[PDB]
Design a protein around this nucleic acid. Structure first.
Length: 14
RNA sequence: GGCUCGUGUAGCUCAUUAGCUCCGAGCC
């Protein structure tokens, strides 16, 4: 998954 | 905890778009 920061990106597993 | 999400009524940032901590939630 990816919290897709409101602007950046944060991958966390799938 | 195993699987999935959310930036996250979680935040910080470096830089990396990431990487630091955690959750909270849903299912079995």
């Amino acid at each position: 998954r990816v919290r897709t920061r409101g602007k950046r990106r944060i991958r966390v597993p799938p």
